[PDB]
Symmetry: C2
């Protein structure tokens, strides 16, 4: 119709916080919160593509697979990927509809299972850098600081396989959840896609997806708005130019806020378009130019 | 976009004595794919569904290792997981065959929720075997398809659509909140419901068995070819089917509610079934 299309990137912390159970209920509960915050964007008349993360979820599922002779064959990590999609996407769907219905907007919303393409010869296959699963001291389990997660390969996304449909599903004004966990990692090679055991960075695949669709906005929701430097002589970002943080990101100043910034930098670089990192709460607000790290065409 | 639209609900050997590791399934799907692709080059618009059982049963088994600092998940969520994995299987399958026929194009899987009646007798009588055999769960009757208006859309634009895998997350609605209920709906009944709602030109349920037969291994034997709606609700009302049972139930309700041909056919012969050179083709009058 007439709304500008926004691509939003919900955190995995936004369903299973570091210190929270991992129970279905527990998770669903937090997702009904988000649902309600995303709804405000739809209400305001924007198009929504909803994407999210996977940490908590893909990690849980593979732990289980690895308890692996309760008569039951162990599924590859890409498959677990397959599985988290069915999951989170089920949760996000059901909530995005509850909210709709709650509003007497009886309406329309799907979840597409996505594959993302990657280079098998990517370096992250011989270097598992990316946290997965849950927390606890003590293949390799790694620091992180807050508590010794598992790590998997994490190679670059290159092509959303399913973009054509998502695209279609937006042109027909459908609120689409897709690319959860940034897509089931696969590789083309010889006219046949097949799946590689990895987990792709939500913020890069959401970046890649944004440019692919040519969205009017890239919005990565967090729980922590902007980025700081806590010290006496601090400054955290609001509206800033693609001049200023191409530069400021290069001063090293960016653990968790890094690939975030990197992704927003990429989108905003290649489409002229504004990109936003905000706390989930203030989502709608940042679209009106009233807060958040909006990084701009410059 | 001139293609008539055909709603096909795949078997269990679409992914399968044999079990069950990932490579093993992938191939059996790869094989149904190539079959389903034939139909899409013939021109029909295709809506592809299937089953959970083995896949959802076994996802469910793994949650029963309920302690590996990882929390067990209700049936309906293993349900979602199934759709993730099965839909990811067919999804990739087709894409490859599309590429192979140099037809680079469009196919998705939508994760699908199905409304059921919280009061359905099957929530007390758990009679559909999942993972002599038989972890057997409740199997109630599918009322509405939640993602219907999107699917109907995704076909109006001729995208190949894969949904109602496992007949979709069983759910109940009440007080305008949808929510999951620990169960597993019959693939076939559900894919029928869907097609009739979508008002498809065709429902089709592919077994292994190329055609249904009354009284088995026994002529007096009659493998059924093309029959009238009169004749076989009548033949069903007299127990010639209680395994082929739901299959025959589903088709009957859809020719009934739409006045449209149904087919029951081995996957090997859908295309031919489409062109009236076998199957159980069950038509109105």
């Amino acid at each position: 119709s007439a709304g500008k299309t926004v691509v939003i990137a919900l955190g995995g912390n936004a369903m299973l916080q570091a210190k929270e159970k991992g129970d279905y209920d527990t998770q669903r509960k937090n997702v009904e919160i988000a649902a309600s915050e995303i709804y405000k964007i739809h209400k305001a008349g924007y198009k929504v593509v909803l994407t999210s993360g996977n940490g908590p979820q893909v990690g849980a599922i593979k732990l289980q697979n690895q308890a692996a002779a309760g008569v039951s064959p162990e599924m590859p990590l890409h498959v677990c990927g397959a599985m988290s999609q069915g999951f989170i996407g089920y949760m996000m769907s059901q909530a995005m509809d509850n909210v709709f219905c709650a509003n007497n907007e009886p309406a329309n919303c799907v979840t597409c299972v996505t594959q993302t393409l990657v280079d098998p010869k990517d370096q992250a296959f011989t270097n598992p850098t990316k946290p997965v699963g849950r927390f606890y001291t003590e293949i390799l389990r790694e620091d992180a600081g807050r508590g010794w997660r598992v790590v998997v390969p994490s190679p670059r996304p290159l092509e959303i396989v399913e973009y054509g449909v998502i695209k279609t599903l937006i042109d027909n004004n459908v609120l689409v959840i897709c690319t959860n966990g940034g897509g089931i990692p696969c590789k083309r090679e010889n006219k046949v896609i097949s799946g590689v055991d990895a987990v792709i960075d939500k913020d890069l695949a959401t970046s890649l997806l944004a440019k692919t669709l040519n969205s009017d906005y890239l919005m990565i929701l967090t729980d922590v708005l902007n980025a700081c430097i806590k010290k006496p002589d601090e400054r955290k970002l609001e509206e800033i130019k693609l001049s200023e943080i191409l530069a400021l990101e290069k001063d090293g100043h960016f653990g968790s806020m890094g690939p975030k910034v990197r992704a927003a930098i990429e989108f905003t670089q290649a489409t002229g378009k504004m990109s936003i990192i905000t706390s989930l709460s203030t989502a709608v607000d940042a679209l009106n130019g009233k807060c958040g790290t909006r990084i701009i065409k410059d």
